[PDB]
Every structure is written in C-alpha cells, then in structure tokens.
Design an enzyme around this catalytic site. Structure first.
Site, PDB file in Angstrom:
ATOM      1  N   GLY A 184       2.735   6.421   9.177  1.00 49.75           N
ATOM      2  CA  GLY A 184       4.393   6.605   8.733  1.00 49.75           C
ATOM      3  C   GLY A 184       4.921   5.535   9.232  1.00 49.75           C
ATOM      4  CG  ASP A 231      -0.250  -4.144   2.770  1.00 44.78           C
ATOM      5  OD1 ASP A 231       0.347  -3.511   1.709  1.00 44.78           O
ATOM      6  OD2 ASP A 231      -0.711  -3.309   3.637  1.00 44.78           O
ATOM      7  CG  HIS A 244      -0.564   0.333   2.401  1.00 44.96           C
ATOM      8  ND1 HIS A 244      -0.302  -0.662   3.366  1.00 44.96           N
ATOM      9  CD2 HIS A 244       0.165   1.567   3.067  1.00 44.96           C
ATOM     10  CE1 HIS A 244       0.421   0.103   4.521  1.00 44.96           C
ATOM     11  NE2 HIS A 244       0.809   1.125   4.185  1.00 44.96           N
ATOM     12  CB  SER A 292       2.219   1.168   6.891  1.00 41.35           C
ATOM     13  OG  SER A 292       2.558   2.249   6.019  1.00 41.35           O
ATOM     14  N   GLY A 293       4.735  -0.697   6.548  1.00 37.21           N
ATOM     15  CA  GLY A 293       5.986  -1.235   5.643  1.00 37.21           C
ATOM     16  C   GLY A 293       6.940  -1.680   6.810  1.00 37.21           C
TER      17      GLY A 293
HETATM   18  C1  LIG Z   1       7.412  14.680   6.552  1.00 36.89           C
HETATM   19  O1  LIG Z   1       6.885  13.353   6.063  1.00 36.89           O
HETATM   20  C2  LIG Z   1       5.486  12.882   6.309  1.00 36.89           C
HETATM   21  O2  LIG Z   1       4.904  13.618   6.969  1.00 36.89           O
HETATM   22  N1  LIG Z   1       5.694  11.487   5.687  1.00 36.89           N
HETATM   23  C3  LIG Z   1       4.299  10.796   6.037  1.00 36.89           C
HETATM   24  C4  LIG Z   1       3.433  10.928   6.859  1.00 36.89           C
HETATM   25  C5  LIG Z   1       2.582   9.654   7.152  1.00 36.89           C
HETATM   26  C6  LIG Z   1       2.170   9.120   6.210  1.00 36.89           C
HETATM   27  C7  LIG Z   1       2.913   8.976   4.890  1.00 36.89           C
HETATM   28  C8  LIG Z   1       4.127  10.038   5.050  1.00 36.89           C
HETATM   29  C9  LIG Z   1       2.743   7.894   3.801  1.00 36.89           C
HETATM   30  C10 LIG Z   1       1.370   8.192   3.211  1.00 36.89           C
HETATM   31  C11 LIG Z   1       1.114   7.521   1.969  1.00 36.89           C
HETATM   32  C12 LIG Z   1       1.446   5.713   1.996  1.00 36.89           C
HETATM   33  C13 LIG Z   1       0.989   5.056   3.307  1.00 36.89           C
HETATM   34  C14 LIG Z   1      -0.542   4.874   3.490  1.00 36.89           C
HETATM   35  C15 LIG Z   1      -1.085   4.400   4.927  1.00 36.89           C
HETATM   36  C16 LIG Z   1      -0.178   4.782   6.134  1.00 36.89           C
HETATM   37  N2  LIG Z   1      -0.457   3.840   7.485  1.00 36.89           N
HETATM   38  C17 LIG Z   1       0.059   3.606   8.380  1.00 36.89           C
HETATM   39  O3  LIG Z   1       1.514   4.074   8.424  1.00 36.89           O
HETATM   40  C18 LIG Z   1      -0.043   2.715   9.458  1.00 36.89           C
HETATM   41  C19 LIG Z   1      -1.324   2.631   9.552  1.00 36.89           C
HETATM   42  C20 LIG Z   1      -1.754   1.708  10.965  1.00 36.89           C
HETATM   43  C21 LIG Z   1      -1.151   0.474  11.045  1.00 36.89           C
HETATM   44  C22 LIG Z   1      -1.333  -0.318  12.269  1.00 36.89           C
HETATM   45 CL1  LIG Z   1      -0.378  -2.063  12.553  1.00 36.89          CL
HETATM   46  C23 LIG Z   1      -2.224   0.081  13.261  1.00 36.89           C
HETATM   47  C24 LIG Z   1      -3.017   1.217  13.061  1.00 36.89           C
HETATM   48  C25 LIG Z   1      -2.748   2.102  11.910  1.00 36.89           C
HETATM   49  N3  LIG Z   1      -3.422   3.305  11.830  1.00 36.89           N
HETATM   50  C26 LIG Z   1      -4.554   3.366  11.515  1.00 36.89           C
HETATM   51  N4  LIG Z   1      -4.676   4.749  11.355  1.00 36.89           N
HETATM   52  N5  LIG Z   1      -3.690   5.365  11.636  1.00 36.89           N
HETATM   53  N6  LIG Z   1      -2.723   4.631  11.734  1.00 36.89           N
HETATM   54  C27 LIG Z   1       0.167   6.106   6.172  1.00 36.89           C
HETATM   55  N7  LIG Z   1       1.384   6.733   6.123  1.00 36.89           N
HETATM   56  C28 LIG Z   1       1.160   8.075   6.422  1.00 36.89           C
HETATM   57  C29 LIG Z   1       0.009   8.159   6.583  1.00 36.89           C
HETATM   58 CL2  LIG Z   1      -1.030   9.620   6.833  1.00 36.89          CL
HETATM   59  N8  LIG Z   1      -0.962   6.939   6.760  1.00 36.89           N
END
Ligand SMILES: COC(=O)Nc1ccc2c(c1)CCCCCCC[C@H](NC(=O)/C=C/c1cc(Cl)ccc1-n1cnnn1)c1nc-2c(Cl)[nH]1
Length: 238
Positions: free
Chosen positions: A186, A93, A44, A188-189
């Site tokens: 942030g 995933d 994802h 994930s992965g």
């Molecule tokens: C300054 O740099 C930043 O701010 N960067 C930056 C900042 C933030 C993000 C990005 C970049 C990547 C987004 C696109 C790809 C990735 C898209 C999904 C990703 N999900 C997760 O990381 C975890 C989820 C997760 C996992 C588990 Cl096991 C449990 C609960 C979880 N959550 C449910 N709701 N919140 N957490 C995510 N990552 C971000 C977001 Cl916004 N959402």
C-alpha cells in the site's frame, strides 16, 4: 510503513493517495505532486488498470477517513508509463499522472523538488519513506499517514542483499541492516523524500522488496535522479 510513526498534518504536502473506484473505491498507491497537473508514482500500480477514468487523486490528506463521497479529488486525464517498464523488479518503475484540473498550491498541498542532475554525487543522510500501507505483511491500510526515517544503502551493498536480481544504478535502496523500518503493501508509488541544504528532494519512488523490513533486505526504490530528463520530456513537451 513498518516501524513508523504518525505524521503530522502538512508534514509531507506532496504526498497523495491514489484511489481506484472499480469495483469499489479504495486506496491503490501513493504518489507525489511534482507540478501543478502532475503526479509521479510507480508504474506497477497500474497493473490491470484499463482506463484513467477509474482513478481519483486525493491531496492534502492526513487521514484516509477524510475521504467520503463528498471529498474533492483530481481526476486523471492520462497515465504515462515508462516505455521500458516490464515489472518492478527489472526497473523503469515510474509513471506520471496528468491531472484533469490544476492543483492550487498551499500549505496542505505543494510540489516536491526533483533531484538535480548535478546532485548525482550528494550523500543524503536525512531520508524518509511515507504512506498509508501495512505495518507488516498481513495487515490493512492505515488511517493516518505514517513516516519512517531510513538510511540509503549503496548499490554494491544492495546487490549483495539481492543476489538473484540485477540491482541497477536506476534503482536506489534504503533500509537498516537489522531491518525493522521499511515500506510495505500500500506504500508503493509514494515518495522517498530526502532533505538536503534545507530543501526536500524526491530521491526515490517506493517500488519493491523481499518481504517488509526484513534483516538484510533493503527496500528498493526507483532512483528519480536517473529519470529527470524522462520526466521533463513528458511534462514540458512543446
Ligand atoms: C482498503 O484498500 C486497500 O486495502 N488497498 C490496498 C492495499 C494493499 C495494496 C493495494 C491496495 C494495491 C495493490 C495493487 C497495486 C500495487 C501492487 C504492489 C504494492 N506493493 C507495495 O505497496 C510495496 C512493496 C514493498 C516496497 C518496498 Cl520499498 C519494500 C517492501 C515492499 N514489500 C514487499 N512485500 N510487501 N511489501 C502493493 N500494494 C498493495 C499490495 Cl497487497 N501490494
């Protein structure tokens, strides 16, 4: 990471930070070093990523402030997404990044072992989730890599907590019934790393959850042991 603490340098030497450079450079996802040109991460993370040319993998990092324009990184030659992947909540995933150059291993960067197919029946009791993600839903990326110890939850219990989803045996859940420690935006992965017989194994890949660290909402991770053969097919191709 919610409810975590700062890692010490070299504690999780398989952890990487994957950045995108488009439109501007920023952290995208976590990942794990599994071989000398291979990162294992979540599929994802690549939503809307149209080319590997915009990616940079940084290894040997504790603090995001170590990353400047002059910081070395690994380029990505190929993004390999599981062909059955549709969305995190349905499973599959998982993705591999094939790096353009080889990682030189040392005390700051080295691979994590994959679980053994013979270890599908082991009970892991020392599991940790790590990352630079938010500490709560409305937050920001953290400078210092965080860690949190979380217990594994059975598939039956996890299914009870996500009544409207199909929690498969290709997923593995982790979290406290009361909440309070989990992955967040942030993270994930990245890895869910478990120590068994003094060896760290990559048990999960941070995938999704309903909110972060909520009571009775465990985090959902890709169950890496169910993908060892897929990983070997992609990384050990003749
Ligand atoms: C300054 O740099 C930043 O701010 N960067 C930056 C900042 C933030 C993000 C990005 C970049 C990547 C987004 C696109 C790809 C990735 C898209 C999904 C990703 N999900 C997760 O990381 C975890 C989820 C997760 C996992 C588990 Cl096991 C449990 C609960 C979880 N959550 C449910 N709701 N919140 N957490 C995510 N990552 C971000 C977001 Cl916004 N959402």
């Amino acid at each position: 990471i919610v409810g975590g603490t700062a890692s010490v340098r070299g504690e999780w030497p398989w952890q990487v930070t994957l950045h995108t450079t488009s439109p501007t450079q920023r952290h995208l996802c976590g990942g794990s070093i599994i071989g000398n040109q291979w990162i294992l991460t979540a599929a994802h993370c690549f939503y809307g990523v149209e080319s590997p040319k915009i990616l940079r993998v940084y290894s040997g990092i504790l603090n995001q402030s170590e990353i400047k324009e002059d910081t070395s990184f690994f380029g990505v030659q190929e993004i390999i997404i599981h062909d059955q992947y549709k969305m995190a909540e349905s499973g599959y995933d998982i993705a591999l990044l094939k790096l353009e150059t080889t990682v030189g291993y040392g005390d700051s960067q080295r691979p994590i072992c994959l679980p053994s197919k013979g270890d599908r029946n082991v009970i892991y009791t020392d599991c940790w989730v790590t990352g630079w993600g938010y500490r709560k839903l409305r937050d920001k990326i953290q400078n210092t890599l965080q860690k949190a110890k979380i217990p594994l939850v059975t598939n039956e219990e996890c299914q009870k907590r996500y009544r409207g989803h199909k929690i498969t045996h290709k997923m593995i859940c982790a979290g406290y019934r009361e909440g309070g420690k989990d992955a967040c935006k942030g993270d994930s992965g990245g890895p869910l790393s478990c120590k068994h017989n003094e060896v760290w194994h990559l048990v999960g890949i941070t995938s999704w959850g309903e909110g972060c660290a909520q009571r009775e909402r465990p985090g959902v991770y890709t169950n890496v042991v169910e993908y060892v053969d897929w990983i070997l097919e992609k990384t050990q191709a003749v």
